[PDB]
Amino acid sequence: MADEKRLLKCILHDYDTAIRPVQNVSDVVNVALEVTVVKVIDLDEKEHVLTTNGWIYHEWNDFQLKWNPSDYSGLKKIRIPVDRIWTPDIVLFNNADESYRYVVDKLAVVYYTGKVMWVPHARLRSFCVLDLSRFPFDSQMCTLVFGSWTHDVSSVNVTLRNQSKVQYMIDGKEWQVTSVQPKRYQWTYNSNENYAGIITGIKLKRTSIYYQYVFIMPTVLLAFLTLLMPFIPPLGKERITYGIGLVLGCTLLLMMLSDRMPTELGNVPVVAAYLAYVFVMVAINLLFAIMALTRVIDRLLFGSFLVLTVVITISMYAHY
Amino acid sequence: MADEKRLLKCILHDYDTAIRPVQNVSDVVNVALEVTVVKVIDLDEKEHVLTTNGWIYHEWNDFQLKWNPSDYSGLKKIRIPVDRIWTPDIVLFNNADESYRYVVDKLAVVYYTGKVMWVPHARLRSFCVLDLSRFPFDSQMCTLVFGSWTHDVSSVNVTLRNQSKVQYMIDGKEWQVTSVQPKRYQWTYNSNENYAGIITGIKLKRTSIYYQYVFIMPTVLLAFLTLLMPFIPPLGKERITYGIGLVLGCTLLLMMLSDRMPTELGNVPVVAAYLAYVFVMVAINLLFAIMALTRVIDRLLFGSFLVLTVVITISMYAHY
Amino acid sequence: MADEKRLLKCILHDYDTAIRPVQNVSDVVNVALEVTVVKVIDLDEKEHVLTTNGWIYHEWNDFQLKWNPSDYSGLKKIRIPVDRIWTPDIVLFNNADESYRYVVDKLAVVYYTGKVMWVPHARLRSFCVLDLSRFPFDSQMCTLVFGSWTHDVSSVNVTLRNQSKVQYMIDGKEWQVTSVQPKRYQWTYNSNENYAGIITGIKLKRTSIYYQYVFIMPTVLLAFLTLLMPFIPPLGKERITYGIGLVLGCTLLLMMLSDRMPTELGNVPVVAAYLAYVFVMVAINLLFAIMALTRVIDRLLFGSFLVLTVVITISMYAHY
Amino acid sequence: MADEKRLLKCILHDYDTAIRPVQNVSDVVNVALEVTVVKVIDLDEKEHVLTTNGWIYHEWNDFQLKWNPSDYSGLKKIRIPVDRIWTPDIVLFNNADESYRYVVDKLAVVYYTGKVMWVPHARLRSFCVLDLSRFPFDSQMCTLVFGSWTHDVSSVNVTLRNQSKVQYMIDGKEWQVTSVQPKRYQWTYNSNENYAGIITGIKLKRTSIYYQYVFIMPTVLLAFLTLLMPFIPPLGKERITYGIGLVLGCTLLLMMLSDRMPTELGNVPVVAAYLAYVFVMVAINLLFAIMALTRVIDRLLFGSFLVLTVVITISMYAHY
Amino acid sequence: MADEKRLLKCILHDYDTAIRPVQNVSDVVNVALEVTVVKVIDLDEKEHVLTTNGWIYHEWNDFQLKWNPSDYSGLKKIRIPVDRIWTPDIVLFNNADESYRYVVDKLAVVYYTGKVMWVPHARLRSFCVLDLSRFPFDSQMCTLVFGSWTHDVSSVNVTLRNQSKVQYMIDGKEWQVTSVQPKRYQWTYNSNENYAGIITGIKLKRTSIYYQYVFIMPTVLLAFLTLLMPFIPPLGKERITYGIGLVLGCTLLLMMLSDRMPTELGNVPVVAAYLAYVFVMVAINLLFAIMALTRVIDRLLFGSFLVLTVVITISMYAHY
Numbered sequence A, B, C, D, E: 001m002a003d004e005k006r007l008l009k010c011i012l013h014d015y016d017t018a019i020r021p022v023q024n025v026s027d028v029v030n031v032a033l034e035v036t037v038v039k040v041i042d043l044d045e046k047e048h049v050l051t052t053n054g055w056i057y058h059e060w061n062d063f064q065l066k067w068n069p070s071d072y073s074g075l076k077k078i079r080i081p082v083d084r085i086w087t088p089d090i091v092l093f094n095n096a097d098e099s100y101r102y103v104v105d106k107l108a109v110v111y112y113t114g115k116v117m118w119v120p121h122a123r124l125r126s127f128c129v130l131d132l133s134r135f136p137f138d139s140q141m142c143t144l145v146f147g148s149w150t151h152d153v154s155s156v157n158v159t160l161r162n163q164s165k166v167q168y169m170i171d172g173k174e175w176q177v178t179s180v181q182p183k184r185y186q187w188t189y190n191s192n193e194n195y196a197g198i199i200t201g202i203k204l205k206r207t208s209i210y211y212q213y214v215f216i217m218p219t220v221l222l223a224f225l226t227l228l229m230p231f232i233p234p235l236g237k238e239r240i241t242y243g244i245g246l247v248l249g250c251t252l253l254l255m256m257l258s259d260r261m262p263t264e265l266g267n268v269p270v271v272a273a274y275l276a277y278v279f280v281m282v283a284i285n286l287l288f289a290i291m292a293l294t295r296v297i298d299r300l301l302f303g304s305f306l307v308l309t310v311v312i313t314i315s316m317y318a319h320y
Ligand SMILES: C[C@H](CCC(=O)NCCC[N+](C)(C)CCCS(=O)(=O)[O-])[C@H]1CC[C@H]2[C@H]3[C@H](O)C[C@@H]4C[C@H](O)CC[C@]4(C)[C@H]3C[C@H](O)[C@]12C
Pocket: A093, A094, A127, A129, A145, A147, A148, A149, A150, A187, A188, A189, A190, A195, A196, A197, B038, B039, B055, B057, B119, B171, B172
């Protein structure tokens, strides 16, 4: 008879998966949750959904599952499936997936003192508010919320593990990630019933360099072409074709931006404002060309276009 | 021996998951359902499908699961998995997903008086009739239906929880949400068999600002260019190229709208009507230019185009 | 002791889920199936797959599950999970999804006489042959097949419920739906082994109005422009640019149609034929323009183009 | 007491789902597998994945599950769920889906002699090598492999059912399907351990007619326009615009082909070669036009273009 | 009574699925893992995710499951479901899918000596760092990591099977695959707790030929057209239209590249740099043309363009 099998049989002789591990009803169970983010899978701005891959550390004491190590040949720790032992109900409150199931959560560690540890590796797809006021490059703070959904603070008191809680670098594909300090706070949706929760913040700064040559370069080139457009002679039979080419190009760029850029509700993106400015400027330039004393009007239009361009550039540097 | 484990064993000594919690066959079970919508995930107009993330509150009395709190060390409430206790069959009648399963519905609260509470967090993807008569910005009322699918009113009588039933703001990404008062009504698909149901209305008003610069700005610019087109001299060798550019631009815009706009059956969108108007106007302008006394005909065509444009603008303001 | 629990225990004292409810091997079990379609979710022509949301009514007699109502306090009907009682194996033979599972099929009704009823709400994604000979607007008959997959007629004899079998309107987004009468017929894949099946027909007529302005309007406008093209003077230095614009526009329309229209195998769509006609006509017009006594040749080409256009229009009205 | 229930209880009094139905360890179990393909769902060339809908016939003898029919009221055959009786492990070796589960495989037939039959309807999404050397229309042979994954030939000897094994037509949407004769062969990944497998071939010939007007018609029209291009006078101020239009059109066609055509590794498609040829020809024509004794050079260029076009046409007919 | 059934009953008389197969707590269990990759399904650069189809070989000794073959009629090996026998927890640490479940892992081999073998066929979708510094054709080394997630080295010591560990060819669709030697190394996330892991490297070199004609050919043709552009006479009334055509073509190519090319963060692709160079060159050429002693300036611009083109070509050959 194996000692480990005997210990497992004795420990779980009469155990249920729906009994809170507390010796008395008055007593409470302490659960420490640590959210570690390893890799940032992606962040869809159209859906405002951040997908990341990282494991979560759960630690809770248990008055049961306790044995003297010397009795069982000096055994220290054991591995037990999560199904049998009691499992605290911790769920991401801002979860976005249809179902919330850990990819690898079939094992947990039990010590002789009763400190039950769980490290279920999981893929977290959560919601995050994105501020797209400036979109050459942005940096948003996304908060992941953990805690019980039906256990009040009087039953389980979620906490944090201060050990090894120092800030450290997070691997990212095109986003530089900084791990913010985690905090805890209580929601109160009913009198005499407060539910604790842990909020962990992650600050992501965009580092992609392709967006500069896909969203800014064509727009600035179209603006430069529109600026050069008034220099064409009115009677050269080329202003109309040049304006048609500019309008087709800016329409194509607008279509590409609509296909790529999301439908932000708060504020229009700076790229969208630049595209609208180039659209209106090319339209007015085409109107002046088709209408065409004339030299002074053309000079005034060129000056207005130049001042608009310099204002746009200084604003871009201001939000750069 | 833990008191909680003893209470759980005694309560569920002989209990089935298919027995309605009623003391007599004549008696009925009252179930109160409250539908709370937290965030509006999205609303696809092409599929007419509204996806939202919100929890649902179920409250039903049970003659079983009753105990004296003083006996079990003054215990007040307990947490039990939904699998063991009886679960009322409440399903969204207008559900759109292949399967209807709550993301987090593995726990429920049982009080000493027997009032069983359930708060299964779920992601509801339902159907909603969308009126796209005016599409610069719309506001539709979407109704979510809850209730039993095989339990008649004689078995379970769905109701509403008037407590804290006041209207309140709902978080939204690009839609402003107002929570309508919920009502109840009975379907009758067979004589002597009426099934109750709860209908909750949500009024969503669009707040996206990008659609103005992606659907209206290019169309109005093309219309303005078409208006300016007749001013070109007939013999300037530029009307044909200008018309070709306009037709290419409007064709590209039509392609973009077809890729973006859904295939509405009721009425054509106002943007589609505007695009058709600009198409026909540019076509007739190109025909007049290629055909080209002439001055009076051109003036009449310009007047007709101007009156059409002013009628379109006044209609747009009317539905604005 | 609750009467309902006692009745449920007595009825299912020794019951299996793999035993056909028949008193003798010679006897057979009658199953009545009614397929009701509530909403037509969509119909993808590229995959030829029709997705609909509707419930299915199953009614089968059972010599077991029978009790005297007076004994159990006059109880009339009971609700039982589908897992315990025997379930006839009815599956859509033309099913297209990877798995065939009802969304809400966890409950069934049992009467005192033994008439077991089941109403599992389900989402049916089936195959349908689409005739795309005429595609301004079409109307196809799609057949849904129900029945056993391994139960022969000697075991289960599928039938129809003539009660309330009258034709009625079906809700649709962009398709008008008519419910055809359902029939039954027997497949014979082996001698002395015939399997019954129920075929229900649904006639869907397209009602979308956006396809007229996305598939027909640009094509007819390009055809009109090509018709007007020969009127341009040969020496005006504008025929070549006009032809280039027309060819670019028709190429863009062809790309849009390829992205939208499926790859039909039977016959080419009428829109595709119209696009091919406009392509060849614009190509020949460009060839004649570049080649350019000349007046008579141009008049003959214009006459041929006009007769081709009138033939196309009369054919379109014929299939309209 | 029902006779069928008594027979089912007696047959499965002590039965396991992990015991091979063999009376002795030396003896082996014969399994006959027949792969029948009903409909070809699709064949994605980009992923090289063929999805089809067809049922599979399994027949294996069992020394258990045997009874005298006369004892049980002359019962002949019974239906039993696949979970209880032993199930041979037959899996498509070239399966492409994440999971391999039959859609409807919950029932099987047991005869009095012990011949266990199984007809699990399934949707097979397998891999197939596609030869895209000629892509106006192709015809590939796709092989589906069935057999055990951990059972050697010494345990289960897969075979074929020669009865009704004649070639017959297979329904297809846009592919004509011919059922090839199935064969068996043994893999040997370890000495003294050979695993049998059944390979069934299906020959599919493309029948789509839309690809001719979406991939060949625009290319041939662009080639014809490029051929006509040299006839334009050098000083007509139209060669440059015509070349620009041709290059824009061929670029759009290349974009469409890239979006549609997959990234074949073996050989470039014939359509891609034709597009490259038209690209290079239009580029050289534009270079000659911009550079522009001249008449002889233009005649030589026209002759070279004509000979290249005739070579391309004869090659196309050769692979046609 | 079948001998095999008796052996299976005797072996698993009292066995648990959560007991490590070790005779003593001090002793450890050796597990040998071999990762074999058969086919490379694909490698998405946008997500940096490599999907492959290959089986994994697990071999672990067991002090239990041991019997004398002579007793049970000389039986050598048996097949047992993975559910009953103990299963080592081996999971891909860099897994990308939501869930990690083997497609076919329902069987395992048990020998008389106790050497338990498992060959669960699986589809591995892992993460891989992609170096896109040069993108005419690349070759990346992707590492797959296997090992325990909660078992330390003191419990299970993962190793490698040196038998038949020679390098061999791997089938690929458009990637040539070389199998690198596998190694083992230990992670240490806590003192006195080291977890072993096996890293297997696969070197993939791109072999697709379509990317040359979709990403390089249009870019080089546009560059050649831009080079030829300065040769146009300033007063020919064709420089403006030629520049408009070039800018439209390069904008379309940029849109296609943005739709196809991923958003790399490390370095911009060489194709993107080439497109930016052609954009800036065509813009400056258009500026010089519109501005237009002049001959010397045009010659200097042509020389600068030629030297830039030759530098780009020599760099491309350097990274070719
Ligand atoms: C609803 C949950 C509260 C969960 C909790 O931890 N405790 C109370 C739960 C009580 N129950 C519902 C179980 C019982 C109800 C009893 S009742 O009487 O109602 O039936 C809270 C916790 C975190 C909250 C938000 C995120 O942070 C950030 C975010 C940014 C936005 O711009 C708006 C959207 C969003 C996603 C917010 C939505 C919502 O606000 C959340 C999910």
